[PDB]
Amino acid sequence: WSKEGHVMTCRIAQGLLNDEAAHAVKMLLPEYVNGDLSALCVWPDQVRHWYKYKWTSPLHFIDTPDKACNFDYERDCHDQHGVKDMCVAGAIQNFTTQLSHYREGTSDRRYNMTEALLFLSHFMGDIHQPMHVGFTSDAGGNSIDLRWFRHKSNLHHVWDREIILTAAKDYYAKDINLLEEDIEGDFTDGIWSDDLASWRECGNVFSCVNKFATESINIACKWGYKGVEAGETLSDDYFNSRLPIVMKRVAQGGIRLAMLLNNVFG
């Protein structure tokens, strides 16, 4: 996601933390964000360019083969040079494990738990963004130039940001907090209120990340790539049919991130 998908994913998660998770997160954050996890959830997108963290660059996405329309861990979860686990599914296992050590203390210098938290948070959002688990050849739609309403864009960015911005502008006065509260409502009192247990119950971590990836690639083929040709214009119909899917994936990432943090600390 661009900034807004991450901020929403993480504010939703933070307001659903249990007391032990809430506390750990508060202790792990710098004083300057005043307890707000969401103030830092886009941090990995900035630092992936830093030499020190260039190893984090393939952890943002999954490349699945063109047209295959499924996800297979062994086949897909590696960077370009075939190094194992270097995809957003592997990243989530990794940093979830690191955080499980914090609780007992039993770890050493190799791991920085503030970075473990921010990475896990970020990457739980990214795996929920369908176009982050899209095709290898178009790099999750980045190569597919197109027009979003009146301006130039690409299919990846339509999912990372344009759909979110158009919704914010059209219905919520450009105020992401209000879009976020609508998403809260839809899972507190609304259309998704009876699905939270099913969203939360995905087996062990390895099993959860396969399920999140699968959902993502599945949506990429059915809703992302589908109906979209390079150079064409996407407007009302595509927005109207896809906004609910974007909103849902923002919700699911928040709930599931809350779920991991609650299990790893509590």
Ligand X SMILES: *[C@@H]1O[C@H](CO)[C@@H](O[C@@H]2O[C@H](CO)[C@@H](O[C@@H]3O[C@H](CO)[C@@H](O)[C@H](O[C@H]4O[C@H](CO)[C@@H](O)[C@H](O)[C@@H]4O)[C@@H]3O)[C@H](O)[C@H]2NC(C)=O)[C@H](O)[C@H]1NC(C)=O
Ligand Y SMILES: *[C@@H]1O[C@H](CO)[C@@H](O[C@@H]2O[C@H](CO)[C@@H](O)[C@H](O)[C@H]2NC(C)=O)[C@H](O)[C@H]1NC(C)=O
Ligand Z SMILES: *[C@@H]1O[C@H](CO)[C@@H](O[C@@H]2O[C@H](CO)[C@@H](O[C@@H]3O[C@H](CO[C@H]4O[C@H](CO)[C@@H](O)[C@H](O)[C@@H]4O)[C@@H](O)[C@H](O[C@H]4O[C@H](CO)[C@@H](O)[C@H](O)[C@@H]4O)[C@@H]3O)[C@H](O)[C@H]2NC(C)=O)[C@H](O)[C@H]1NC(C)=O
Q: Is residue 3 at the binding interface for a second copy, with CB under 8 A as the rule?
A: yes
Task: Decide if 239 contacts 228 (C-beta within 8 A).
Answer: no
Binding site for ligand Z (CB under 6 A): 19, 23, 30, 32, 40, 43, 54, 57, 112, 114-115
Q: Enumerate residues 6+ apart whose C-beta is below 8 A from 42.
A: 3, 6, 7, 122
Looking at the Cβ atoms of 121 and 154, the one nearer to ligand X is 121
| 6-65: contacts with a second copy (CB under 8 A) | 27-31, 42-43, 45-46, 49-52, 60-61
Q: Annotated binding residues for Zn(2+), as ranges?
A: 1, 6, 45, 60, 108, 122, 126, 132, 156, 160
Q: Which does 156 bind (CB under 5 to 8 A by kind): a second copy, ligand Z, ligand Y, none?
A: a second copy
- Mask for 103-142, x = binds ligand Y (CB under 6 A): -------xx-------------------------------
Q: Is residue 91 at the binding interface for ligand X, with CB under 6 A as the rule?
A: yes
Q: Is residue 85 at the binding interface for ligand X, with CB under 6 A as the rule?
A: yes
Q: Which does 242 bind (CB under 5 to 8 A by kind): ligand X, ligand Y, a second copy, none?
A: none
Least separation, in Å, of the C-beta of 104 and a second copy? 6
Least separation, in Å, of the C-beta of 116 and a second copy? 9
| 115-144: contacts with a second copy (CB under 8 A) | 139-140, 142-143
| Residues engaged in binding a second copy (CB under 8 A) | 2-3, 27-31, 42-43, 45-46, 49-52, 60-61, 102, 104-110, 112-114, 139-140, 142-143, 154, 156-157, 160-161
